């Protein structure tokens, strides 16, 4: 517990001596001055508080270490080298800039090192934009800041129960009856009169940052709704507006020449010498070829192959669209196949100028897949960051004019864009219910599509010929005066098929209608779509940043979605720059995320210790050896006292170390338990597997729950939290007071008698209804989503009666991919019928619930399709192709009618009931 540290004094003098790792910097500075007095040039030094330490952190950046309560082990300098420097200048920007680098897992100097104007202009614009919003937030009032920081958590939308009100500082409390449908201004008034015997206060839940306020009634709050249904009394606190302020403070068409490019040289190729190298090439707009795929002459396989060839394409320079991308692929054929690598390049830059001169494209390796295409146009345009090791292709776009030439402005496109009953009957049949003949028909009637069929804009964009500039200008003319579509349609337009910048801008324009509640449901999908964006500065990035600055919760989850993919080279740059901008516009929340980061940093190290110890020693000894590592001052303080990543309104206060443990699984998941002034809260830190799959499924189950709750149907689901935090790392919410089916059973009345012990007497009939409602919901959810590999180990039941599923590994038919049938277990049907062999009344309600649930999802079926389609970006094995989306089309049965689909569901229901006995 000690290390030799190099010290560098501002007079040029060098001290070197051991210090403890747990010792903080302020303490280290005192030891330094105590040894500096016995070294030359001491008299010329100022006092210790005049100086500040500087180190080289893990991201290779100088960091002015202003907070001297940090421990040297927590600072993590690259080498143990501290240097004293003057504590003056603009220390605010200096402190933030370093704290960003550590927090995002990427140094800001790496953005500078690229010498890229696009990057620098993104940083300039977005940081300025974000800083202004943060400034503007501070000038605004306390109520508005409360909306930003602690937004309203409401249910998707007559009794008289008690409520235990308190005030800040006072130990005494007040219990009294208040109605469910009251507006919280009235609830404060009642408590305020009790204090003696309104608008300057707001309510707060105990042990939480969840505040009750605004125009809504008390029943629509999640805390109240939970307290009413369960039985317990709400425990509140009356916070003053002063205490809230304390938180606030403390020309192109001229050039008709055919398009071409010079294929010069390849670099750092690694293939078999017997073969010969070929460079496949082709132009693209979205997932559609603009012209034929040109190929190069064969050259022998070496590290540095040379071609020097002209590669002429069958399209003019004037005919190119705005988002045109030259997609390459390096192969290895036999002289008389093997994809090595691929790389894409945008012909026009971010400022709309057509690119010229040499471009060194550092290529990405090709993975073999079920499609097996020539090129990969759906891949990222951004070059491979591993520049020195990975392969590359030297190319050169030729000069075509004396001065450079831009893609025409909106004004010039609009100028060029201007200017029967039988064919109208054909248009109905195509759109309401595409082939080459149908494409030309719709394009002919494109004006009638705009007038009479606004929802089918997506169809019209695909049929448009993007390889002709005349067709492009006419489509954009219509687009710029196209009527505003709903959310559901706008989500479709964000997909990789619609790359055009005006199309994106239209899609975002329609998404500005979203409430923060509804935006949260699609936030994961919207993050993943950024992979399809070509340039860094885009409307979706701005939109996402706008909402994050507007709402702290959205910002919080925007951070962790982006942060958790910083290990991925293809998005590290794009995501890193967004996280920088976010951070600058939310300095208050940076402090929270820093605690969370360092808590997660220790759990990695704690899990790695447990992983190594599990191989050598047995479980009881390892469990005790875990607690010793936890109980250390650096580990205990970092894990204790922070807001939860899974829900930042929840407060993880005191680590209950004795209650912590770990399962003997493949990846050894840590089980961390907490306690706060409310009651108990727990988390599971999983490191080893990827949790995005499990998150997506849990999100979609949570979406079903909301969609059911909107239609007056509460199926008592448990959409618990799941958050990827990093490289195969994440937290998961502990569903308390519950157990697996395997542990309960290890016969006929196994689960039934478990409920009898947990719900004796009158509570038994309630818990069965909780089971029946929940089982129905999870039966329908698992059916629709196509979730296989279900069993006793990964199904759970709460003590209240609610059944729920966990740890979703596979979905949409996969396990080869076949149709997963509707599953009713004999044990579950036994509990639903109340221990009876036959109970038609209760089973008919259960049948009714599953049918009602299933019907509701068909009404919002396109949402599920559109959301799943956007998730193809994420590169999950089980959600890659269009046949994975097809699984949802069939399971929900959207092609069939509402009557037909429901009749087929009943057959699958009845066959599941028969299969239960077998």
């Amino acid at each position: 517990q000690s290390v030799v540290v190099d010290f560098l004094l501002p007079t040029g003098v060098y001290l070197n001596f051991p210090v403890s790792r747990n010792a903080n910097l302020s303490t280290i500075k005192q030891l330094l001055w105590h040894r500096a007095q016995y070294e030359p040039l001491f008299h010329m030094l100022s006092g210790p508080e005049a100086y500040v330490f500087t180190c080289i952190n893990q991201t290779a950046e100088q960091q002015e270490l202003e907070d001297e309560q940090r421990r040297l082990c927590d600072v993590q300098p690259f080498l143990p080298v501290l240097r004293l420097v003057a504590r003056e200048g603009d220390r605010v920007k200096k402190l933030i800039n370093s704290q960003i680098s550590l927090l995002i897992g990427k140094g800001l100097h790496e953005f500078d090192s690229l010498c890229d104007p696009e990057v620098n202009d993104f940083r300039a614009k977005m940081c300025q934009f974000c800083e202004e919003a943060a400034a503007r937030r501070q000038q605004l009032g306390w109520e508005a800041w409360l909306q930003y920081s602690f937004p309203l958590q409401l249910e998707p939308s007559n009794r008289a129960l008690l409520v235990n009100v308190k005030f800040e500082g006072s130990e005494e409390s007040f219990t009294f009856q208040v109605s469910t449908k009251d507006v919280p201004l009235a609830l404060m008034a009642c408590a305020l009169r009790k204090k003696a015997t309104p608008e300057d206060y707001t309510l707060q839940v105990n042990g939480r940052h969840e505040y009750l306020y605004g125009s809504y009634p008390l029943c629509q709050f999640q805390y109240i709704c939970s307290c009413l249904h369960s039985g317990l009394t709400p425990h509140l606190t009356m916070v003053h507006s002063s205490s809230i302020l304390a938180m606030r403070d403390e020309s192109l068409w001229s050039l008709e020449q055919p398009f071409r490019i010079e294929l010069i040289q390849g670099s750092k190729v690694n293939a078999d010498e017997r073969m010969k190298l070929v460079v496949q090439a082709g132009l693209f707009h979205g997932n559609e070829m603009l012209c034929k795929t040109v190929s190069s002459s064969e050259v022998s396989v070496c590290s540095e192959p040379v071609w020097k060839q002209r590669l002429e394409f069958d399209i003019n320079i004037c005919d190119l669209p705005r988002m045109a991308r030259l997609c390459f692929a390096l192969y290895a054929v036999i002289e008389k196949d093997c994809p090595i690598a691929w790389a894409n390049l945008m012909l026009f830059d971010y400022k709309d100028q057509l690119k010229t001169g040499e471009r060194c494209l550092y290529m990405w390796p090709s993975v073999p897949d079920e499609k097996g295409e020539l090129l990969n146009p759906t891949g990222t345009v951004r070059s491979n960051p591993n520049t020195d090791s990975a392969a590359a292709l030297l190319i050169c776009l030729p000069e075509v004019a004396p001065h450079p030439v831009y893609y025409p402005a909106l004004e010039k496109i609009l100028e060029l864009g201007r200017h029967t009953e039988e064919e109208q009957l054909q248009l109905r049949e195509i759109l309401e219910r595409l082939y080459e003949h149908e494409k030309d028909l719709v394009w002919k009637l494109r004006h009638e599509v705009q007038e009479h069929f606004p929802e089918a804009l997506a169809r019209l964009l695909l049929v448009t010929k993007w390889n002709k500039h005349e067709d492009v200008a006419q489509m954009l003319y219509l687009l710029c005066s196209w009527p505003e579509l709903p959310v559901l349609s706008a989500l479709e337009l964000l997909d990789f098929s619609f790359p055009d910048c005006h199309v994106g801008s239209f899609a975002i324009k329609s998404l500005r209608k979203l409430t923060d509640d509804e935006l949260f449901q699609y936030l994961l999908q919207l993050v993943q779509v950024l992979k399809y964006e070509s340039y860094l500065d885009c409307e979706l990035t701005k939109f996402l940043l706008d909402r994050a600055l507007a709402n702290r919760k959205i910002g919080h989850f925007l951070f962790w979605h982006l942060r958790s993919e910083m290990h991925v080279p293809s998005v590290a740059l794009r995501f890193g720059l967004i996280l920088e901008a976010y951070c600058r516009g939310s300095t208050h929340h940076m402090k929270v995320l820093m605690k969370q980061g360092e808590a997660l940093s220790k759990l990695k190290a704690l899990n790695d210790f447990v992983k190594l110890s599990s191989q050598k020693t047995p479980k009881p000894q390892t469990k005790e050896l875990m607690h010793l590592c936890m109980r250390q001052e650096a580990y205990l303080e970092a894990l204790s006292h922070l807001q939860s990543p899974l829900d930042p309104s929840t407060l993880l206060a005191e680590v209950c170390v004795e209650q912590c443990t770990f399962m003997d699984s493949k990846m050894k998941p840590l089980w961390i338990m907490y306690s706060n002034e409310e009651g108990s809260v727990g988390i599971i830190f999983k490191n080893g597997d990827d949790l995005r799959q499990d998150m997506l499924t849990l999100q979609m189950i949570q979406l079903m729950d909301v969609l059911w709750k909107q239609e007056g149907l509460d199926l008592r689901m448990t959409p618990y939290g799941c958050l990827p935090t990093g490289d195969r790392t994440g937290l998961i919410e502990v569903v308390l007071r519950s157990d697996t089916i395997a542990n309960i059973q290890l016969n006929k009345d196994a689960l039934l008698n478990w409920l009898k012990s947990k719900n004796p007497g009158e509570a038994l009939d309630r818990a069965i209804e909780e089971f029946t409602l929940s089982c129905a919901g999870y039966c329908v959810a698992t059916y629709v989503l196509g979730i296989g590999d279900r069993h006793s180990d990964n199904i759970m039941i709460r003590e209240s009666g609610q059944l729920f599923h966990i740890d979703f590994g596979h979905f949409l038919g996969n396990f080869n991919r076949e149709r997963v049938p509707f599953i009713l277990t004999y044990d579950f049907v036994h509990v639903i019928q109340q221990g009876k062999t036959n109970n038609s009344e209760k089973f008919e309600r259960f049948r009714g619930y599953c049918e009602r649930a299933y019907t509701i999802l068909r009404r919002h079926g396109l949402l599920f399709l559109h959301l799943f389609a956007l998730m193809r970006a994420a590169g999950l094995p089980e959600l890659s192709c269009s046949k994975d989306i097809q699984y949802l089309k069939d399971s929900l049965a959207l092609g069939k009618t509402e009557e037909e689909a429901l009749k087929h569901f009943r057959v699958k229901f009845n066959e599941a009931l028969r299969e239960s006995w077998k």
């Binding site: 040029g12 060098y14 070197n16 893990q58 290779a60 950046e61 690259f78 293939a271 073999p368 960051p385």
Partner: protein
């Protein structure tokens, strides 16, 4: 204008599927190493930047030591304090000898980065030798499977051969 028995073809479907799955596992092993080594190479190159910035600070200190000491070495020589000068210059020599250790440490990382850069290229070469076999075994498996679907073999009998 456009052939063995079914049992014999199904035998080859089982064989070619097993050979495909083995090669699919072997590629996934090499791709894991390709993923892993890419993280390690980046870390090494980030660590070399850290070494550089550390060494940069030491060289700034060496500049500071020479510029600052000019006034006091002269002043202590006038007052007759050669011992204070000996403390100052020996300390500077102690600073310089530390750099030689850090420079030596940076060279070891550069050599490991050189060795690990070779392994990256060797793995990628081993991957690009297997892709021909893997892609062909995917195609062959599919062609035999489609041949049997034409011949009208039941799904249950195909699943036995695939496993």
């Amino acid at each position: 204008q456009q052939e063995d028995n079914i049992e014999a073809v199904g035998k080859k479907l089982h064989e070619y599927n097993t050979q495909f799955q083995e090669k699919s596992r072997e590629y996934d092993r090499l791709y894991e190493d390709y993923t892993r080594t890419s993280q390690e190479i980046q870390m090494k190159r980030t660590a070399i930047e850290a070494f550089n910035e550390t060494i940069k600070i030491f060289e700034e200190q060496c500049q500071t030591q020479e510029r600052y000491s000019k006034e006091y070495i002269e002043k202590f020589k006038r007052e007759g304090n050669e011992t204070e000068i000996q403390r100052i210059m020996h300390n500077y020599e102690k600073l310089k000898s530390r750099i030689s250790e850090i420079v030596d440490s940076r060279r070891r990382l550069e050599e490991d980065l050189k060795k690990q850069a070779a392994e990256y290229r060797e793995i990628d070469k081993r991957m690009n030798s297997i892709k021909p076999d893997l892609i062909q075994l995917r195609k062959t498996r599919d062609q035999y499977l489609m041949w049997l679907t034409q011949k009208g073999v039941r799904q249950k009998k195909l699943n036995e051969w695939l496993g």
